[PDB]
């Protein structure tokens, strides 16, 4: 067979230990899920420094905690805009997930609170910026570099899926790089507890699995499809399916055809053909052997999964960091005031936040 006795025994034991870890992690998650924490700080506890990002519902700002001097990333959501954009459930669910999960590649929520106007989630500041920026600047990542990031996503999805959480929002724009060069996942607006199937059309065109496009009930396998897209994009510099307009992207996604750069290794192409598999009965991550089909694939043969989890592997790339509060890896935005109303807005809708 492919493994001799020692290697087979070691692999079997490793896989059983993963099961044991995940059972404990699920028990811990469910405790925090059933008893979420609230109201752990206030706005006047922080100095606002710079806007790190903006969206249709709010902003993320670099802030400095006055008492400790620690920097944090503060997501500010305008309650009235959240209601107008039909994002109440997503906002409450994101906070509930963030306060309940615990994993080295998932951002840590340190404080949350609300006022008359806004909701606030204060997260660890991840100073390396988005993977997206580094990828577009460098062009493409070499296979070992792509593999280092991919391994972290595999472990993170293995963790999330054990909690019955589907992620649904994977893309380089949503992956931040920390001071040690490891990945942080921050956005949970589309994540959902799904033991069986779910049906919502959500995601980003290039990263949508065929079954989402085709309006099917779908499961956690969409995240493994998205991993395939991510690995391809990291290693090529562009995603597998692109076009001027989303409709044409969707036609390519559902076609069952994918083409690869000539510099992709055969091991990489084999992995990608099994992740970017339109047939759900054949997609890696969706078979009887679960995540092990991915973790045991030849492309990952050099990956020490425990060392990645322990953050003991030297990162391929360390973002520039001139000190605490350095924002050089983020875009520049116009700075707007944080207006707080004299009257409470949308109190009922956000009572649980």
């Amino acid at each position: 067979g492919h493994m001799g006795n020692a290697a087979a025994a070691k692999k079997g034991s490793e896989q059983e230990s993963v099961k044991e870890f995940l059972a404990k992690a699920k028990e811990e998650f469910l405790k925090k899920w059933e008893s979420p924490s609230q109201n752990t700080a206030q706005l006047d506890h922080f100095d606002r420094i710079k806007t790190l990002g903006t969206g249709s519902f709010g902003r993320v700002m670099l802030v400095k905690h006055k008492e400790t001097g620690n920097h944090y990333a503060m997501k500010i959501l305008d309650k009235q805009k959240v209601v107008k954009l039909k994002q109440i459930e997503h906002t409450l669910n994101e906070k509930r997930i963030l306060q309940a999960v615990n994993f080295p590649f998932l951002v840590k929520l340190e404080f949350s609170f609300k006022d008359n106007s806004n909701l606030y989630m204060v997260m660890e500041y991840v100073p390396g910026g988005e993977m997206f920026s580094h990828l577009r600047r460098i062009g493409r990542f070499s296979e070992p570099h792509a593999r280092f990031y991919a391994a972290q996503i595999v472990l993170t999805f293995e963790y999330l899926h054990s909690l019955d959480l589907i992620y649904r929002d994977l893309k380089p724009e949503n992956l931040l790089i920390d001071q040690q060069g490891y990945i942080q996942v921050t956005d949970f607006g589309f994540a959902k507890r799904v033991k069986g199937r779910t049906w919502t059309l959500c995601g980003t065109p290039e990263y949508l699995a065929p079954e989402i496009i085709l309006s099917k009930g779908y499961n956690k396998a969409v995240d493994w499809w998205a991993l395939g897209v991510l690995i391809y994009e990291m290693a090529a510099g562009y995603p597998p399916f692109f076009a001027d307009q989303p409709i044409q992207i969707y036609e390519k996604i559902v076609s069952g055809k994918v083409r690869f750069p000539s510099h992709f290794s055969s091991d990489l192409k084999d992995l990608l053909r099994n992740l970017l598999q339109v047939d759900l009965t054949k997609r890696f991550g969706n078979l009887k052997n679960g995540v092990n089909d991915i973790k045991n694939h030849k492309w990952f043969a050099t990956t020490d999964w425990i060392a990645i989890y322990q953050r003991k592997v030297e990162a391929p790339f360390i973002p520039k960091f001139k000190g605490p509060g350095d924002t050089s890896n983020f875009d520049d935005y116009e700075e707007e005031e944080i207006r707080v109303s004299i009257n409470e807005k949308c109190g009922k809708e956000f009572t649980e936040f």
Binding site: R136, E173, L201, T204, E206, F242, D244, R259
Partner: peptide, 18 residues
Amino acid sequence: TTYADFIASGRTGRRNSI
């Protein structure tokens, strides 16, 4: 080339959700 096709797509910047 495929890279040129990617540039031609106009979808080289940050991509929003649908």
